[PDB]
Scaffold this active site. Structure first.
Site, mmCIF file in Angstrom:
data_model
loop_
_atom_site.group_PDB
_atom_site.id
_atom_site.type_symbol
_atom_site.label_atom_id
_atom_site.label_comp_id
_atom_site.label_asym_id
_atom_site.label_seq_id
_atom_site.Cartn_x
_atom_site.Cartn_y
_atom_site.Cartn_z
ATOM 1 N NE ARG A 171 38.942 -30.346 10.222
ATOM 2 C CZ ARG A 171 39.091 -29.221 9.819
ATOM 3 N NH1 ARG A 171 39.644 -28.331 10.756
ATOM 4 N NH2 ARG A 171 38.904 -28.798 8.703
ATOM 5 C CE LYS B 188 41.782 -34.075 7.755
ATOM 6 N NZ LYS B 188 40.492 -34.811 7.127
ATOM 7 C CG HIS C 273 45.041 -33.168 3.370
ATOM 8 N ND1 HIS C 273 44.280 -31.697 3.287
ATOM 9 C CD2 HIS C 273 44.036 -33.983 3.354
ATOM 10 C CE1 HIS C 273 42.927 -32.157 3.316
ATOM 11 N NE2 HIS C 273 42.895 -33.557 3.496
ATOM 12 C CB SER D 235 37.198 -30.203 2.434
ATOM 13 O OG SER D 235 35.909 -30.726 2.519
ATOM 14 C CE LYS E 57 42.195 -34.658 0.195
ATOM 15 N NZ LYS E 57 41.019 -33.352 0.239
ATOM 16 C CG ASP F 108 41.774 -37.145 4.233
ATOM 17 O OD1 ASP F 108 41.563 -36.316 3.476
ATOM 18 O OD2 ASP F 108 41.948 -36.785 5.511
#
Ligand SMILES: Nc1ncnc2c1ncn2[C@@H]1O[C@H](COP(=O)(O)OP(=O)(O)OP(=O)(O)O)[C@@H](O)[C@H]1O
Ligand SMILES: O=C([O-])C(=O)[O-]
Ligand SMILES: [Mg+2]
Length: 532
Positions: A65, A213, A232, A250, A254, A269
């Site tokens: 991103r 996102k 999240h 991140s 997860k 997520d």
């Protein structure tokens, strides 16, 4: 373009797109496979076939991103409600954009898509019909269409029948903005949102994560305003109906830790939490593939087959993939529809109220204990702190474990979360999937054993003591786990080594939390944090 559900060129003309001669509506997985494998394709559109049967593509110059290029139109709909980058006290990427500049950007994208062969994918964001968004994705690159088909909720023939979009995302990755300097923007690229028109424009960057996102940011805006938690986190359910959520930044685990063969996966997520329980916003999972191990992560490895989409991985001439190679980027990934995992919640990705809330963190300082049971106040303190450090020590404090995706003030998210947790009688825990005194990261085997002890109730019945400074309750022993690692001081040659580093980390937490003390509620939470 599929069956009775297609779009007319007159409909695209309403968005500002002209001269479209070929329209591919609701592309099947088979067509996508053919488009990506076209031997005449050049550049970043081209995909390659791997020995695993999955196609691999490169996302271009952008392999992640670009928050510096993210903008939100400031108008009479978003003005008094959005957590703006130029007004609050907290740092964020919600940079304001004028309605006039938006019109300029919309012209760039619509013109780029005009006279092209277009892919149109209609999908849902949110498993519940009452709070879901009907999104229409428009793109000129096959693999980007594949990405949205994998990541979002795929509608039924009957749902497509009366599909009416309430949000439109036009991906114009191939175009750029030549007037950026005179418009006060960061670069020629752009990821813009307009809540009055309910649209997202993308330019310059091919990275699919912007769409994923991007819609998460919109859900993070709409849901909390309706009293619904937008989180999240990853989530799964046990046979008894016991739901567990895993928050974290991140690389903290997860996705890896929620993919547990013993439990039914809900999502990995993005989830919401309403009066009925927890629900997934997506229709697929997005796994990290760097140094992927078939032995350590069999379920995720076996998900890599036809229909899955590899990103920026290195493929050898013989079709085989080198998962260890991170020359292109460390952010190598693969998306796949959720059903590629055997044990999942079907047909709808949702379950009851969560009773176990787990905060994952990768501590590169090697100070925090493997596992600890948090108090109500410590839960709110750590949620707002959002800590993690390094990868594979540089600290990172991201509110709610996902500040980059927040559209409202962090406290608004904490409020709704606490509301839901208290009603369900949920318990919180802090897990360090990071480092310790040995200088090496804790094994995934030991971490999975810790997660099991939390879920089966072993930790809730264990004898505990208090770790100084952070005042965290840690167990004396835990089934299936090495006793020596439970206390972080034991991993160093001397407990004084841990002491020095502990003080350093403690101060970092205290300084960061200072921006939340401007309210009596946040001031009361400092007592819950670490103390010298
Ligand atoms: N003890 C551990 N616990 C969890 N993951 C570990 C551990 N040791 C190594 N790893 C690796 O760390 C990475 C964790 O990544 P994962 O995809 O779960 O992150 P995530 O929190 O889902 O990230 P994102 O928010 O980017 O999706 C994986 O590559 C995993 O193999
Ligand atoms: O780009 C990201 O951070 C993602 O989508 O995981
Ligand atoms: Mg993940």
């Amino acid at each position: 373009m599929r069956v009775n559900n297609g779009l007319t060129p007159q409909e695209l003309e309403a968005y500002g797109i002209s001269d479209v001669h070929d329209i591919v509506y609701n592309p099947s997985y088979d067509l996508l496979y053919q488009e990506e494998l076209d031997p005449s394709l050049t550049g970043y559109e081209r995909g390659v076939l791997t020995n695993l049967g999955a196609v691999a593509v490169d996302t271009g110059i952008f392999t992640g991103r670009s928050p510096k290029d993210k903008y939100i139109v400031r108008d009479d709909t978003t003005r008094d409600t959005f957590w703006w980058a130029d007004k609050g006290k907290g740092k964020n990427d919600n940079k304001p954009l004028s309605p006039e500049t938006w019109q300029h950007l919309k012209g760039l994208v619509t013109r780029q898509l005009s006279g092209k062969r277009l892919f149109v994918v209609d999908a849902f964001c949110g498993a519940n019909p009452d709070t879901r968004l009907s999104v229409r994705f428009i793109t000129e690159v096959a693999w980007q269409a594949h990405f949205v088909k994998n990541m979002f909720i795929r509608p039924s023939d009957e749902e497509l029948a009366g599909f009416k979009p309430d949000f439109i995302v036009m991906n114009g990755a191939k175009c750029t903005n030549p007037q950026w300097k005179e418009q006060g923007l960061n670069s020629e690229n752009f990821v813009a949102f307009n809540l009055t028109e309910r649209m997202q424009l993308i330019g310059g960057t091919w990275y699919g994560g912007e769409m994923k996102k991007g819609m998460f940011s919109m859900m993070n805006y709409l849901l909390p305003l309706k009293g619904i938690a937008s989180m999240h986190c990853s989530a799964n359910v046990g046979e008894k109906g016991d739901v567990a959520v895993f928050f974290g930044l991140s690389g903290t685990g997860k996705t890896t830790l929620s993919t547990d063969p013993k439990r039914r996966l809900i999502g990995d997520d993005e989830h919401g939490w309403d009066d009925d329980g927890v629900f997934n916003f997506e229709g697929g999972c997005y796994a990290k593939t760097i140094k992927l191990s078939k032995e350590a992560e069999p379920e995720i490895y076996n998900a890599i087959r036809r229909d899955a989409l590899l990103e920026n991985v290195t493929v050898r001439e013989d079709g085989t993939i080198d998962f260890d190679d991170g020359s292109k980027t460390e952010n190598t990934r693969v998306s796949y529809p959720i059903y590629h995992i055997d044990n999942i919640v079907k047909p709808v990705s949702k379950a009851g109220h969560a009773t176990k809330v787990i905060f994952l963190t990768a501590d590169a300082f090697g100070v925090l204990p493997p596992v600890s049971r948090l108090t109500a106040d410590q839960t709110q303190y750590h949620f707002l702190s959002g800590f993690t450090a390094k990868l594979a020590p540089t600290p990172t404090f991201s509110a709610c474990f996902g500040a980059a995706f927040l559209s409202l003030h962090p406290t608004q998210y904490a409020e709704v979360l606490v509301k839901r947790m208290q009603a369900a009688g949920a318990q919180a825990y802090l897990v360090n999937t990071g480092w310790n005194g040995t200088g090496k990261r804790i094994s995934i085997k030991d971490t999975r054993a810790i997660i099991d002890a939390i879920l089966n109730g072993s930790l809730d019945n264990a004898e505990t003591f208090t770790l100084p400074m952070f005042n965290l309750a840690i167990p004396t022993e835990l089934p299936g786990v090495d006793t020596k690692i439970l206390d972080p001081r034991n991993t160093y040659a001397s407990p004084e080594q841990w002491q020095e580093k502990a003080e350093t980390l403690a101060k970092l937490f205290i300084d960061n939390f200072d921006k939340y003390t401007d309210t009596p509620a946040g001031a009361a939470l400092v007592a819950a944090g670490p103390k010298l």
